[PDB]
Amino acid sequence: DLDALWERYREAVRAGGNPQALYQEMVWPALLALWREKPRVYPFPQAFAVSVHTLGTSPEATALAILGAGAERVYVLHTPESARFLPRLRQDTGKDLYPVEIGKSDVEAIYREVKRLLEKHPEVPVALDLTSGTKAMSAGLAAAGFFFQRFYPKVRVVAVDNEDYDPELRRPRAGTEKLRILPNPHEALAEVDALFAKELYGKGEFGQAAAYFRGMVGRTGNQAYALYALLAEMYRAWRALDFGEALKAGRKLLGQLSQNVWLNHPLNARREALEAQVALLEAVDRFLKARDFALKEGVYGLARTLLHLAQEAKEEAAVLAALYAYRALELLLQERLALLGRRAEAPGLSPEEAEALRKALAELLGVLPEEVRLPAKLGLLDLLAFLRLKGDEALGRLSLAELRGLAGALKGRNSALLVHGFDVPSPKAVEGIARLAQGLLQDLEARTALGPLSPEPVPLGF
Amino acid sequence: EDLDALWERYREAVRAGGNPQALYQEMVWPALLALWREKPRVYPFPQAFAVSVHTLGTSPEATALAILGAGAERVYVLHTPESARFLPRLRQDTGKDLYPVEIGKSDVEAIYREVKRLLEKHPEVPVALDLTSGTKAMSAGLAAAGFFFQRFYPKVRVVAVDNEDYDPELRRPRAGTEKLRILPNPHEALAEVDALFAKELYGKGEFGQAAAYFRGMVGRTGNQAYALYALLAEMYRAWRALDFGEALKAGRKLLGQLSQNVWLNHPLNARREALEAQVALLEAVDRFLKARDFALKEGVYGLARTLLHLAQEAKEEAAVLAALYAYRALELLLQERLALLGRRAEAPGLSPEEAEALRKALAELLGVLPEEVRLPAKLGLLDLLAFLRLKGDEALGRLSLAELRGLAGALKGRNSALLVHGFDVPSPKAVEGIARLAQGLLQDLEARTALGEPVPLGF
RNA sequence: AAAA
């Protein structure tokens, strides 16, 4: 019917008939008629409120799309070059077209126009037709369409497909055009969203990367992102000093990674590190639960965690960095005190010891010994001077100048912004506290079943 | 060269009955191809590509131009069953080995899969995604894939053969006016994703990290709008960092920018009254921290409010942190009620009568006898509270002895408490009692200040 | 290559 008309149109062009105008006179009334009757919309017709169409110099295409989507309000992203075809378009579709002028390659302004129209019509179904117009114009429209259904699920990118295309006439064969709704590539490639999780993980926003991954197991039915979620949850908890949780998640990950099904999960190409880390968490959670400094591995893990936390907060959470480093030094020092028999909270000071400690503290804080009251618990500076006086070897290596600086720092624990007190801690002092804590940490590391490994996270492997 | 002559002759020939496709192939295409073999016309500038990737439709001369212009060593050609035919013509024109991949004429998911693949296998090299030839659905699939993977494969350039004169009747570019053009990535240019992440962090409290995203947003967008945004997140970071001078500096900078002509319509101006208020609070706190004078009720209130809100944020996860913030807020609110009485918690000039009444107060509270109670030199949290109740303090006096009983273990929670002197994540209800007491004292203090949440980002 |  139309196929006969198309064959006779080809014959007509082969007779020297000018193909633009000949097509408009001969074929186009018939094809336009069929579409005004039964718009060919491939995955059945869909109910659209607004359609947005690029317009190029084949307005018949845009006509087909406008009828096919059947929208009420119709926008036409056209170029200065294709503006001249709006009137005929309007007369064909019998629709009032809101025109918008855009460059023929202004991908960017196309895309902004789509974001504008979408926000003008947020809750209603929208057909973004990219049929007519340059590839750049369609790139704008399609980038915006495929990106914005995350936020406007009712927005559908559409095109006028054909099932037969004439390469000499550079037209579809009349009657073989249909309007194909196009799927979003973020349906069957939801897995690619992992890179966002990979990025959220790569900045250390573990809590967020974990929520992202749990979404991934919910979005694309894969359970393998659940293992990533486990790892990220582990790091969030570990950074939070929630070693109980940190371990719960890490153990769950190592159990899953044990299974035959996850033998190939990329996290396995890091298992030696992962295992080490969860063991650290084990060591800490036991030590935290035991509170005895005999568990050198747990003390090491808590000290290394605290010092890691203070290091990464050294510039943008200075008061928090101080908190972390002060607690780390107290830990390492108290472990040193357990080594030499005693425990700082109720050390048994001999009177000779109390006088030795008072003399050291005096000639460290710059007072006469008779000004010195010994507190019942050894606080941080008392512990420092006392371990020094009991011959703790690593602490011996401290010449009285860096010791004086540490004493100055140490009086800022007794009062600070987050302690019962008021002063924001000097970053010089905090770095000195952390340098001494780091030295003790390495001493301790030389002494643990763990050996070395770091809080810093294992690669996702993807 | 004047292939313009040839193009006019080719037009002359078609208008007189000639086949446009064959005639283009014999008159125009040789000459045009000659010129593009000499000097490929790449708009921004030619750029070395490891790999170019071209959708191919029934106009292989387009993908030929695109191949020549991108000059990539390794050339994929996405094609359809219906366009596979032209692969030999393309091979001849480009003199280049091709890596054809067959795809459906509307297989947007597949262009997508293919880009994911080629990019993974060539992750760290410049790759041009040319969407010239083929269907709008084909180019659209390549473009979606490109603009998306560009973030993670930053050497990727989505490119396309533009033309400065398109013969609508020949449905062809006029020969010579074509040019290969790096299309801007709109996702990048607008940094919609960096915004979405920065919004996520900003809402979730990760102010410093949102700030870094905004600062990078400036460079990706060329729009200093996001500089202001960075400043805002900057200030909130410094504020939660408890560095109120840093927060005040940044906030004032921001208010000075939002005062300017350029940023009258900046979306943060939609909440300017808030910002103004908050920056005033910043100054209040900053003045008070500089003076430690508790007549500065607005500074004391702001800093107690800051601590109480940090202890609200952290209680879910930072748990220890949440208690430290709560204790600090309570000790603060308490020192302010105490300063209202002319007394300093730090050294109470308590007369021997007050010492007796405070040992007595703590005895009755804790249930022990008064000489079990040894009064410290600095009034501790519970001691401060019992001394305010001693001294006629109305809000603290309105606390039942059983409430103070249930609270006194919580105010014993200090020390212990992993980040202080022990190993305890103090109980969420332990933190709760402190935080609600502090909330009451905070609201009371808020009344006595003439001043009487981070602000929405506006997107 | 501005309905492949």
Is A205 in contact with B201 (Cβ distance < 8 A)? Answer: yes
Give dist(CA A63, CA A53) in Å, integer.
9
Q: Which of B240, B262, B284 is the last residue of a domain?
A: B262
Show residues of chain B in contact with A147, CB under 8 Å: 144, 147-148, 187, 192
Other beta carbons less than 10 A from residue B390's beta carbon: 16
- Taking a C-beta distance cutoff of 8 angstroms, is the pair B415, A319 a contact? no
3-state SS, residue B134: coil
B235 domain-assigned? yes
- Nearest CB neighbour to A180, from listed B106, B241, B242: B106
Write the CB contacts of B396 (distance below 8 Å, at least 6 apart in sequence).
Answer: B337, B385, B388, B389
User: Which residues 146 to 185 of A reach strand C, CB within 7 A?
Assistant: 159-160, 162, 165, 167, 170-172, 174, 177
Nearest partner of B384 among B444, B422, B343, judged by Cα: B343
Burial of A212 (0-12, 13-18, 19+ CB in 10 A): buried
Tell me how the structure was determined: X-ray
Give dist(CA B45, CA B36) in Å, integer.
14
- Taking a C-beta distance cutoff of 8 angstroms, is the pair B241, A319 a contact? yes
Other beta carbons less than 10 A from residue B115's beta carbon: 28
Cα distances (angstroms) measured from residue A306 to each of A94, A241, A299, A335, A437: 71, 8, 10, 15, 10
- Taking a C-beta distance cutoff of 8 angstroms, is the pair A105, A136 a contact? yes
CATH number of the domain within which A81 lies: 3.40.50.10770
How open is the CA angle B333-B339-B344, to the nearest 5 degrees?
A: 100
Cα nearest neighbour of A61 on chain B: B136
Output the DSSP codes for B401-435. HHHHHHHHHHHH-SSSTTTTSS-----HHHHHHHH
Tokens of A12: 């007509």
CA–C1' gap, A120 and C4, in angstroms: 33
3-state SS, residue B351: coil
Show residues of chain A in contact with B241, CB under 8 Å: 316-320
Helix A318-339 vs helix A427-445: crossing angle, to nearest 10: 40
Q: Is the CB of A305 under 7 A from strand C?
A: no
- Taking a C-beta distance cutoff of 8 angstroms, is the pair A79, A133 a contact? yes
- Taking a C-beta distance cutoff of 8 angstroms, is the pair B175, B32 a contact? yes
Would you give the DSSP letter of residue B42? B
B184 domain-assigned? yes
Same domain, B73 and B28: yes
User: Which residues 1 to 60 of B reach strand C, CB within 7 A?
Assistant: 32, 57-59
- Taking a C-beta distance cutoff of 8 angstroms, is the pair A152, A49 a contact? no
Q: Which of B190, B217, B242 is the last residue of a domain?
A: B190
CA–C1' gap, A166 and C3, in angstroms: 11
CA–C1' gap, A168 and C4, in angstroms: 12
Question: What is the layout of strands, in order, in the sheet containing A155-162?
Answer: A97-101, A73-78, A50-55, A126-129, A155-162, A177-181
Is A327 in contact with B241 (Cβ distance < 8 A)? Answer: no
Nearest nt (C1') from B104 Cα? C4
Tokens of A28: 């186009």
A372 domain-assigned? no
Cα nearest neighbour of B146 on chain A: A143
Nearest nt (C1') from B65 Cα? C1
Write the CB contacts of A158 (distance below 8 Å, at least 6 apart in sequence).
Answer: A51, A65, A68, A69, A127, A128, A129, A130, A131, A179, A180, A181, A182
Nearest partner of A181 among A112, A114, A121, A130, judged by Cα: A130
Burial of B400 (0-12, 13-18, 19+ CB in 10 A): exposed
Question: What is the layout of strands, in order, in the sheet containing B178-182?
Answer: B98-102, B74-79, B51-56, B127-130, B156-163, B178-182
- Taking a C-beta distance cutoff of 8 angstroms, is the pair B134, B78 a contact? yes
Same domain, B58 and B27: yes
CA distance B197 to chain A (A): 9
Cα nearest neighbour of B132 on chain A: A135
| Contacts A–B by Cβ distance under 8 A | 204
Tokens of B125: 């090299």
Same domain, B67 and B176: yes
Give dist(CA B410, CA B431) in Å, integer.
7
- Taking a C-beta distance cutoff of 8 angstroms, is the pair B208, B243 a contact? no
Is B242 in contact with A417 (Cβ distance < 8 A)? Answer: yes
Nearest nt (C1') from B24 Cα? C1
Give dist(CA B303, CA A167) in Å, integer.
74
Same domain, B216 and B181: no
Give dist(CA A43, CA A179) in Å, integer.
9
Per the DSSP assignment, residues forming a β-bridge with B130 are: B54, B159
CA distance B37 to chain A (A): 23
Nearest partner of B232 among B222, B223, B213, judged by Cα: B213
Q: How many CA atoms lie less than 13 Å away from A141 in the CB half-sphere?
A: 35
Give dist(CA A457, CA B178) in Å, integer.
50
Same domain, B43 and B172: yes
Tokens of A63: 């006509």
- Identify residues after which chain B is interrupted (C–N over 2.5 A): 452
- Taking a C-beta distance cutoff of 8 angstroms, is the pair A214, A229 a contact? yes
Task: State phi, psi for A113 to the nearest 5 degrees.
Answer: -65, -40
CATH number of the domain within which B258 lies: 1.25.40
Give dist(CA B31, CA B176) in Å, integer.
9
Other beta carbons less than 10 A from residue B427's beta carbon: 14
Nearest partner of A141 among A106, A172, A193, judged by Cα: A106
Give dist(CA B329, CA B335) in Å, integer.
10
- Taking a C-beta distance cutoff of 8 angstroms, is the pair B78, B114 a contact? yes
Show residues of chain B in contact with A138, CB under 8 Å: 136, 139-140, 143
Same domain, B183 and B210: no
**First and final CA of chain A: distance in angstroms?**
56
Same domain, B45 and B11: yes
Cα nearest neighbour of B130 on chain A: A135
Number of domains in chain B: 3
Tokens of B151: 């973030």
Would you give the DSSP letter of residue B49? -
Buried b or exposed e, range A97-135, using 16+ CB within 10 angstroms: bebbebbbbbbbbbbbbbbebbeebeebbbbbbbbbbbb
Same domain, B239 and B184: no
Cα distances (angstroms) measured from residue A380 to each of A174, A326, A344: 88, 8, 9
Give dist(CA A142, CA B136) in Å, integer.
9
Cα nearest neighbour of B108 on chain A: A185
- Taking a C-beta distance cutoff of 8 angstroms, is the pair B184, A107 a contact? yes
Give dist(CA A307, CA A410) in Å, integer.
17
Q: Which helix (H) or strand (E) is B98 found in, with range?
A: strand B98-102
3-state SS, residue B3: helix
A69 domain-assigned? yes
Show residues of chain A in contact with B200, CB under 8 Å: 208
Tokens of A370: 């008779």
CA–C1' gap, A371 and C2, in angstroms: 91
Other beta carbons less than 10 A from residue B388's beta carbon: 24
B380 domain-assigned? no
- Taking a C-beta distance cutoff of 8 angstroms, is the pair A105, B183 a contact? yes
Is B192 in contact with A15 (Cβ distance < 8 A)? Answer: no
Q: What is the distance of C-alpha A71 from the center of its chain?
A: 37
Nearest partner of B442 among B284, B240, B301, B282, judged by Cα: B301
- Taking a C-beta distance cutoff of 8 angstroms, is the pair A460, A347 a contact? no
Give dist(CA B302, CA B137) in Å, integer.
57
- Taking a C-beta distance cutoff of 8 angstroms, is the pair B111, B103 a contact? yes
Is B58 in contact with A203 (Cβ distance < 8 A)? Answer: no
Widest pairwise Cα distance in chain A: 121
Give dist(CA B70, CA B67) in Å, integer.
5
User: Which residues 206 to 265 of A reach strand C, CB within 7 A?
Assistant: none
Nearest partner of B272 among B232, B242, B307, B331, judged by Cα: B232
How open is the CA angle A430-A362-A403, to the nearest 5 degrees?
A: 30
3-state SS, residue B205: coil
Q: Is the CB of A137 under 7 A from strand C?
A: yes
B285 domain-assigned? no
Helix B297-314 vs helix B272-291: crossing angle, to nearest 10: 110
A142 domain-assigned? yes
Cα nearest neighbour of B16 on chain A: A16
SS3 labels along chain A: CHHHHHHHHHHHHHCCCCHHHHHHHHCHHHHHHHHHHCCCECCCCCCCCEEEEEECCCHHHHHHHHHHHCCCEEEEEECCCCHHHHHHHHHHHCCCEEEEECCCCCHHHHHHHHHHHHHHCCCCCEEEECCCCCHHHHHHHHHHHHHHCCCCCCEEEEEEEECCEECCCCEECCCCEEEEECCCHHHHCHHHHHHHHHHHHHCCCHHHHHHHHHHHHHHCCCCHHHHHHHHHHHHHHHHCCCHHHHHHHHHHHHHHHHCHHHCCCHHHHHHHHHHHHHHHHHHHHHHHHHCCCCCHHHHHHHHHHHHHHHHHCCCCCHHHHHHHHHHHHHHHHHHHHHHCCCCCCCCCCCHHHHHHHHHHHHHHHCCCHHHCCCCCCCCHHHHHHHHHHCCCHHHHCCCHHHHHHHHHHHHHHHCCCCCCCCCCCCHHHHHHHHHHHHHHHHHHHCCCCCCCCCCCCCCCCC
Best residue of A135, A149, A286 to probe chain B, by most B CBs closer than 10 Å: A135
- The dihedral through the CA atoms of B365, B366, B367, B371 has a sign that is negative
Name the residue with tokens 């992962």: A274
Same domain, B164 and B227: no
Would you give the DSSP letter of residue B350? -
Cα distances (angstroms) measured from residue B302 to each of A269, A301, A391, B254, B400: 50, 37, 48, 20, 28
Sequence length of chain B is 459
Same domain, B7 and B112: yes
Pick left, alpha or beta for residue B152 (phi over 0 → left; psi -120 to 50 → alpha; otherwise beta): alpha
Other beta carbons less than 10 A from residue B4's beta carbon: 12
Q: Is the CB of A132 under 7 A from strand C?
A: yes
Cα distances (angstroms) measured from residue B111 to each of A350, B55, B130: 80, 9, 12
CA distance B246 to chain A (A): 10
Nearest nt (C1') from A54 Cα? C2
Burial of A201 (0-12, 13-18, 19+ CB in 10 A): buried
Cα distances (angstroms) measured from residue B271 to each of A149, B259, B449: 29, 13, 22
CA–C1' gap, A137 and C2, in angstroms: 9
Nearest partner of A284 among A336, A317, A234, A244, judged by Cα: A244
Write the CB contacts of B379 (distance below 8 Å, at least 6 apart in sequence).
Answer: B338, B345, B348, B387
Would you give the DSSP letter of residue B175? T
A394 domain-assigned? no
Q: Which helix (H) or strand (E) is B227 found in, with range?
A: helix B225-240
Q: What is the distance of C-alpha A231 from the center of its chain?
A: 14
Name the residue with tokens 């780091």: A438
Tokens of B40: 């490929």
Q: Which of B167, B190, B213 is the last residue of a domain?
A: B190
Give dist(CA B9, CA B61) in Å, integer.
19
Cα distances (angstroms) measured from residue B59 to each of A170, B10, B135, B267, B362: 9, 17, 11, 47, 92
Give dist(CA B357, CA B352) in Å, integer.
9
Tokens of A424: 């924001």
Nearest partner of B334 among B352, B321, B348, judged by Cα: B348
3-state SS, residue B163: strand
Output the DSSP codes for B6-38. HHHHHHHHHHTT--HHHHIIIIIHHHHHHHHHH
Give dist(CA A386, CA A355) in Å, integer.
11
**First and final CA of chain B: distance in angstroms?**
52
Q: What does the CA dihedral A148, A149, A155, A159 come to, rounded to 10 degrees?
A: 80
Pick left, alpha or beta for residue A391 (phi over 0 → left; psi -120 to 50 → alpha; otherwise beta): left
Show residues of chain A in contact with B237, CB under 8 Å: 316
Cα distances (angstroms) measured from residue A248 to each of A230, A288, A298, B426: 9, 15, 16, 19
Give dist(CA B79, CA B60) in Å, integer.
10
Give dist(CA A116, CA A123) in Å, integer.
14
How open is the CA angle A324-A427-B235, to the nearest 5 degrees?
A: 85
CA distance B330 to chain A (A): 11
3-state SS, residue B182: strand
- Taking a C-beta distance cutoff of 8 angstroms, is the pair A418, A431 a contact? no
Tokens of A227: 């293992």
Q: How many CA atoms lie less than 13 Å away from B380 in the CB half-sphere?
A: 16
Nearest nt (C1') from B134 Cα? C4
Tokens of A141: 């429209």
Other beta carbons less than 10 A from residue A282's beta carbon: 18
- The dihedral through the CA atoms of A7, A11, A13, A14 has a sign that is positive
Widest pairwise Cα distance in chain B: 120
- The dihedral through the CA atoms of B210, B211, B213, B218 has a sign that is positive
Q: Which nucleotides of C are covered by protein (CB under 7 A)?
A: 1-4
Same domain, B45 and B186: yes
Name the residue with tokens 């439709």: B57
Whole-number CA gyration radius for chain A? 36
3-state SS, residue B56: strand
3-state SS, residue B119: helix
CA distance B200 to chain A (A): 9
Q: Which domain holds residue B241?
A: 191-262
Same domain, B166 and B30: yes
